[PDB]
Amino acid sequence: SKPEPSTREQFLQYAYDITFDPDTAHKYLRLQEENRKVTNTTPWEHPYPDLPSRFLHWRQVLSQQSLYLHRYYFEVEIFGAGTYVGLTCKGIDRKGEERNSCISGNNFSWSLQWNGKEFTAWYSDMETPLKAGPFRRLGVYIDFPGGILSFYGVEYDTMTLVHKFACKFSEPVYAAFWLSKKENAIRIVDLGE
Ligand SMILES: [Cl-]
């Protein structure tokens, strides 16, 4: 196993293309920019086909890509109180009304919330208030073999650690996004250039 990354340049060696999966998106979420932008447009709903994959209650969407057995890095730009960014497993219950169907409410999902005043780390209904931020751009690092999920505030070439989770990774994971409030928006940064 390599040295852990330190500089933005080192994280960018693990740059991985993420896109939102329209088959998962809650109807109150609009996808744009070739599935690299998601907005909560409540009360404007979008005519997605009914699918078993689609979230019913929670305003969530997953990545098309799964992450399994390597190191990965992607950046997102986030806007609005009530956004969560994290990881989950395919088995997350898409139709569930309970918090076990949201990415802050079960033992196989890990997430970072911006609540309007602070960042908060979530795992299985347990919350950890955090000091760092706010930051409009986050870097999300997944070391699948090393059982690490870490979030950084990115400003120019500076990276400020927001939180580092220790994760017991077994299954493939998906990036997971929850836009709980009207006008919440998340863009996947094109790290291509
Ligand atoms: Cl919601």
Residue numbers in the entry: 358 to 550
Q: What's written in the study?
A:
The tripartite motif (TRIM) proteins form one of the largest subfamilies of RING-type E3 ubiquitin ligases, comprising more than 80 members. TRIM family members typically contain a RING domain usually catalyzing ubiquitin transfer; one or two B-box domains mediating protein–protein interactions; and a large coiled-coil domain region, which is involved in self-association or oligomerization with other TRIM E3-ligase proteins. About two-thirds of human TRIM proteins feature a PRYSPRY domain, also known as the B30.2 domain, in their C-terminal region. All characterized family members shared the same overall PRYSPRY twisted β-sandwich fold consisting of a 7-stranded and a 6-stranded antiparallel β-sheet.
Moreover, TRIM16 has been reported to act as a scaffolding protein that facilitates autophagic degradation of protein aggregates. For the TRIM16 structure, CASTp failed to detect a pocket in the canonical substrate-binding site due to its shallow nature. The binding site generally tends to have a shallow topology, and conventional pocket analysis software failed to detect a sizeable pocket at this site in some cases for TRIM16. This does not, per se, mean that small-molecule ligands cannot be identified, as demonstrated by the recent discovery of ligands for TRIM58. However, developing high-affinity binders is expected to be particularly challenging for those family members.
